[PDB]
């Protein structure tokens, strides 16, 4: 279980931080419910995609 991510849902050889890197220099919408004010990733409703993602997406409030 990764030591870079600190998570225990994958090994180091598969840490999303490998490919999820950014080169740095209105309202929000949730992909789960068409609701505004929050990202679809950290939303309260039952998820609309029968497809899992125990590890987060780009679209969390963590602003990553």
């Amino acid at each position: 279980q990764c030591t870079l991510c600190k998570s225990k849902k994958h090994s180091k050889e598969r840490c999303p931080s490998i490919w999820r890197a950014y080169i740095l220099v209105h309202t929000i919408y949730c992909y789960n419910c068409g609701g505004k004010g929050h990202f679809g990733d950290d939303c309260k409703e039952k998820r609309s995609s029968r497809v899992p993602n125990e590890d987060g997406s780009a679209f969390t409030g963590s602003n990553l």
Binding site: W19, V25, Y29, C33, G34, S49, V51, A58
Partner: protein, 323 residues
């Protein structure tokens, strides 16, 4: 099996694989981008065809619209033309039959096929000398308001063209880009990318420059629309040039929804219906994006854990897109 866009453009020594990727995207896009000669020929043949139309109707002109007037076209794809004399409406077909008969006779076409892009009748063919693919109609096929959105989106959105080309290529290698068989249409694809770009945490915060981050955004695009997007419940629209989600349940115009699981994007010329209704194969589309995500991410792991010697001359995109 070859990846010509890689030649003389190896980035195997890059520290961040997500840069590797970004650079390869730009290589592909430039490789699929036209040359001066290519342009010269295209103009000649178009003019040659215009000249053949004048012969039937000296009042008519001919204009390129769509993928080819933006630069969102895949090489070898049909270039769309509208013919302009008052020849449309219900006289549309009768006039296409005449144009067809005439093209064949004058040798500017071999096999000519009549088809339809949303109740607009179209004539597809190949100009033999140049081998260029043409589709002619007496009416633009991409709405009017839609077309304008496209040009505007392309102005205020760095990265839009590049990601669209990649996604377009991907969808095409699988036959997932034709509405006739329930694939995604052109405007729809543009919409998805545009939306994604404009409401990405690092982008609305102006923290990131897409053109310097198209590797990650590519992956994250397939991640959003492949793994997380609430297709059942979420729709896409534009309130004031701003990409927007709204719940299906609020869109009353269509809420007796016979089929729940399907892409819903608000028609720019009619907020009353979605232009994505015809994409009935949306289930396999989602599977494919996820496939793309799986392939790209797996590949990234595979390289970031190999000897620089094993990376030499390798391609990240190569197996995801086909080409």
């Amino acid at each position: 099996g070859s990846y010509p866009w890689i030649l003389n453009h190896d980035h195997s020594k890059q520290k961040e694989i997500s840069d590797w990727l970004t650079f390869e995207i730009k290589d592909f896009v430039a490789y699929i981008s036209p040359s001066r000669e290519e342009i010269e020929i295209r103009n000649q043949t178009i003019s040659t065809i215009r000249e053949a139309v004048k012969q039937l109707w000296p009042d008519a002109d001919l204009h390129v619209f769509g993928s080819y007037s933006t630069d969102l076209y895949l090489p070898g794809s049909d270039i769309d033309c509208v013919v302009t004399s008052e020849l449309g409406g219900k006289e549309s077909r009768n006039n296409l039959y005449s144009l067809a008969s005439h093209l064949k006779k004058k040798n500017l076409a071999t096999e000519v096929e009549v088809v339809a892009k949303a109740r607009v009748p179209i004539i597809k063919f190949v100009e033999p000398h140049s081998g260029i693919h043409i589709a002619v109609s007496f009416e633009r096929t991409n709405g009017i308001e839609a077309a304008k959105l496209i040009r505007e989106w392309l102005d205020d959105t760095p990265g839009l063209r590049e990601l669209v080309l990649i996604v377009k290529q991907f969808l095409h290698a699988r036959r997932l880009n034709n509405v006739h068989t329930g694939g995604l249409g052109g405007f729809s694809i543009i919409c998805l990318v545009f939306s994604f770009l404009h409401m990405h945490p690092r982008i609305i915060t102006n923290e990131i420059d897409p053109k310097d981050n198209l590797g990650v955004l590519l992956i994250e695009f397939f991640e959003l629309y492949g793994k997380n997007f609430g297709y059942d419940d979420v729709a896409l629209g534009s309130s004031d040039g701003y990409p927007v989600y709204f719940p299906k349940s609020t869109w009353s115009a269509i809420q007796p929804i016979k089929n729940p699981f399907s892409l819903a994007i608000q028609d720019p010329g009619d907020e009353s219906n979605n232009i994505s209704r015809g994409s009935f194969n949306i289930r396999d589309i989602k599977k494919a994006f996820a496939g793309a995500f799986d392939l790209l991410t797996n590949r990234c792991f595979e390289l970031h854990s190999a000897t620089f010697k094993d990376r030499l001359g390798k391609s990240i995109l190569g197996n995801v897109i086909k080409y």
